[PDB]
């Protein structure tokens, strides 16, 4: 059972967000820079909006999970 | 594998490590050994047999130490602490120096000459003890009991032992040596009054002779010794044919009732009413003695039967034929059943075959029973040693100093190269004096010096150092005594151990 | 692989020394409560010296030895076991200083022997006769409970403990071995402890309010089942065919029916009116159907009671315990003067009190069902063993380390045997005792030397056993306050300390054993 | 150690230092809590959801500690959770604050045992002056404004954005069915989450709310007694399958015929026994449905564990596995059974009208179930603060406005008594100051400013501070006249249990 607390702990949660915010950074038009995301099930995947792939990701932070949930909303 | 010099040094260490604490335990003053378990528990002991068995010894020479204390325990049971101390100190003082020159076999020859030197000194030093006077033997027992450290239940035990050992004394061998104490036994009864402890004749049995039917009182009728063969035979006196058929069954059964019938007839003639069968007694067979009007005691061990045979004092017979008043049951057996509790206790009294006795001990519980029984065990050992050799030796280190100067005088007179081993056996004796000095808490230098001085003036007849007064003291005055035979045997075993160990110069797996 | 001579003594003293620390902060009321999670991980609240040794994990031979001897003391007095350790530790310390300078263990031991005889005779002189009145029992009761709990909760347990001992005089026992039934109640506060004269029952009826006040109670304690349902059994296991099991189900249910009927016949024969009630206590179930019928007749029938309730009832009430019902006279059944049902918490406890021919009292501890309710259980436990001693001895002294300074003073001055050999252990023996008073001062925050010179001087001038007022940690007369100790407490610290010391002192080897 | 025995993890240095530092870490989750706050603490536990709380009970049970000192206080907090609602946070911060102050005493040269003594004294004086800090009280419990002011404080402690709507709502939906004067039930009120719609769209419904959709006809009779079964249908006969489809074709005919005739009997037994509403946690087949339309029984499709639980406590029900016909024994106190849609989802509505054993439901409507879990903390504490078992609840200033008052009285009182006790008495004042510190930290300004300016205004018995701009700079707000009130009983057990907890744990050294 783990417990973590602090002002550097807060800083952690935001840092996780940036990582998901980068996945979806640009997809407004058709330029940016993609990398084909192929799963371990042996399926190749792309989408037309970058929020789709982001939904599939499982984040190991609960704070980062909130930002996943508002995407779905 | 060990070779040469490794072995001589090994012997001395192994002996020595056992010794340090175990020497201290000797005397009323007793140091207590801690043994620490892996489970984090503790067992506290003063008894030499216990210490030795528990510890893990790696070295074969150490194992020889243990086994010689088994030797001692079997003969007496006191002095068990002592033998390894004595045996150790022969090796320390003599060995390493004389090896460098190189003569092992010499040190060994010297040990046994010296041993003889000590046996002879003892007869002079000791005065006779009357072996039929209770008072005189009593004080001796009083010395030995307080080593264990029980001093309450002890007082009773001493007196009960005196009559028990004396009554099982009757061994003839053309020289009239007594080692008989194998007819003696202790009957244990949980419950009752704490102070009813007495002796009753024959041998009394309870370890498997507790049965609900045994004829309540026999005050005349005989016991009939049997290792028969009271059980049926399907042929004449051996089985030749099997029951597997209706026809085989029918024929065989006639033979089986006959065999039983003729056995019972040879049993009844000499008038019993209590009849013991070791084995060879069946459900049909026992039913036949009931119908004979004979109470049968049956399925009770071979050890009980050796005991019951000794109790009437009459020989056993495996002979199924014509058992007479002359052959079995010779003399009078008698059988008393008491309920002390609601449990059947069997006394078998009367032994013809001059005397025999065993001990009643009644606790009020198991725990109360035990305390007396051990201290009685010490007690009947003394009673016996006094009977064996009828001289009582003064206790402590007084006897040891007498022999210490006899070897100084002998070793000078002979002036062999045995001289220096004599001198090492003289100093090996002195450990017992050192142990008694330590016991008070006085310096070794001061009291040993004085003791040696007493040799010169009064020859250490009885003037030793006693550890419960820390001063030079007449041992006779105090009522410190021990029997000659216990001293002699302890000394004896210690020289054997010193000689055997010194012969191992190599150990090879 | 051996620790010999100096190395063997070294191991014992070092251990005693760390231990001593722990069990001084359990000493008297000024000591501190302790919990274990170091024994098994679960939460225990305990403040007794013996008990705390068992709960932990002890592997050290010297700690273990002290725990074993502890066991005997704890049975008889249940107090002074916080003390046992303290006196042992100091007793060794004294010895160590002399040995290091140059002294033999054996001379130390001799002077212990001399020490012990004098010290025991001092108890006999100094003992003050007391009465056997309530007032005098209150003061053995309150100080002993004060050791094992707070001051606040202890004063509540004081009342319960004392009325029980008065009732035990009536039976004419000089001992206690009954009236020690501790029963727990479900509550939201622990600052109540109630005395119930007779017994208390864990569960009551499954149907409330049958007749929850019984004026005239005729107690049949039974234990055969009046419920065994509709289950298909044969010998208590499944059998190959349906039908064979069923046939037994009929006869078994039929057996139960007749036994319930015997309660209906029994009420007329013993009772005859509803002006009298009838009590049933069954340790096994009873059908919901059977309760309604019994209830209108004016019978209270209890279900799911324990085997411990049953044995207690048979002693106190004068009852019987039977494996049948039948039609029995009131001569066989026990009587209780009163029955009342008191519902409090989530479980309702039927009391069966004002028993005729009692020999069991129940001390009913209310509590929240935390470890705190277990804490008052073990406080109450040793407070019963304390007031037992007061009945044993005739004489109870004022304590709080009052006794111990008096005894130490007597040794320092003369040689008890007149020899120098004895004298070396005797100094050692006297300073060992002083730990108990001085350390009450230490907990409180009052320098230890200052109380020794004062407390000892005031003995000399007066002849009073002046003691310590715990809270200030300054001296005061222990008699008036009520800080008292029995004859048995001050006897059993003395015996345990000597015997335990002399076997560790006299080590010369410790060698490992399988 | 020096011993290979005598196991401890506390004692010496570790009792004095390590235990206190651990209490301090637990109680950090309540120096962001209690009254005005915007803190949220997310805790996961593999519950397939995110659990958002600003309640001490759920934080504490999740968090395991291996030391008896920190572990013991969690029990004291639970005790105050049973007897009363909100203030759970206040129990732990107090014990934890007092223990930080304690260690400083130990440092100087003061002993443990007098310090222990001086708290019991301070706790007794604080309670004695406590009913003299009553400033406002209810007299009618059927009046929505007097109840809602009380409620408000519980809600506040959660979020400072949901105080107004909820505090009104609970009082509107009733927790005043009971007299609350000897007797109150809290398992006959639940907080029932209805997914969908906003949380200002949270509604009043009286009696048992179950989410699961209604099937068949609906009853409105007064002979409707509840029968509860976890699984009364699974198929009355289970298949084995020998062609790995069916065993086989002529047999499949019989398996269906026997199901339909056994279910007829079962569902007709329910009909006859007076059970006219059956709760099915099983599966409604066509055959089972077809029977219940004929007998006229309201049918509840499905249930989950949570729904079964509330039936067994409220009804006096049992949930039996069945496939062989049963009869009533669950019984019920509910006469009426109606049908009403809450959330635009068909909800089963139970009601009867009485005082004692009467039922109510604060039912919620929310975007997600996570948003509803926090709201739920606010609401369940608001039912548990209602319990006082009087109608004059002797309200004292909520929100931590009492705290400075207690602190001022106690510090003066300390001066009067002599000895070492007094220092503990002074510390006891500064432990209450914990509450004004935590409100300051969220408010955005330091501790020095708030405590001094509350002290400056002297005896007031109103002063406490919010999350606002008014809460920062002049550091003065009215929390007597904002209708921020808490109950005398809630503050009593909070202070009482916390002083008891701090004393037992300061004693340990094993």
JSON list of C-alpha atoms in Angstrom, two decimals, chain C residues 11 40 64 68 115 132 239 261 319 321 335 353 389 445 484:
[
{"chain": "C", "resi": 11, "resn": "UNK", "atom": "CA", "xyz": [25.64, -12.49, 27.58]},
{"chain": "C", "resi": 40, "resn": "UNK", "atom": "CA", "xyz": [2.01, -11.23, 15.49]},
{"chain": "C", "resi": 64, "resn": "UNK", "atom": "CA", "xyz": [13.08, -16.58, 28.14]},
{"chain": "C", "resi": 68, "resn": "UNK", "atom": "CA", "xyz": [9.35, -18.80, 32.75]},
{"chain": "C", "resi": 115, "resn": "UNK", "atom": "CA", "xyz": [20.91, -12.11, 52.11]},
{"chain": "C", "resi": 132, "resn": "UNK", "atom": "CA", "xyz": [-10.96, -8.11, 56.53]},
{"chain": "C", "resi": 239, "resn": "UNK", "atom": "CA", "xyz": [-26.66, -42.28, 2.31]},
{"chain": "C", "resi": 261, "resn": "UNK", "atom": "CA", "xyz": [-44.16, -31.14, 25.00]},
{"chain": "C", "resi": 319, "resn": "UNK", "atom": "CA", "xyz": [-29.44, -26.35, 38.81]},
{"chain": "C", "resi": 321, "resn": "UNK", "atom": "CA", "xyz": [-27.60, -30.23, 33.45]},
{"chain": "C", "resi": 335, "resn": "UNK", "atom": "CA", "xyz": [-33.98, -21.47, 41.62]},
{"chain": "C", "resi": 353, "resn": "UNK", "atom": "CA", "xyz": [-29.33, -12.86, 39.11]},
{"chain": "C", "resi": 389, "resn": "UNK", "atom": "CA", "xyz": [-3.88, -12.70, 48.60]},
{"chain": "C", "resi": 445, "resn": "UNK", "atom": "CA", "xyz": [10.44, 13.77, 36.78]},
{"chain": "C", "resi": 484, "resn": "UNK", "atom": "CA", "xyz": [-0.53, -0.89, 49.61]}
]
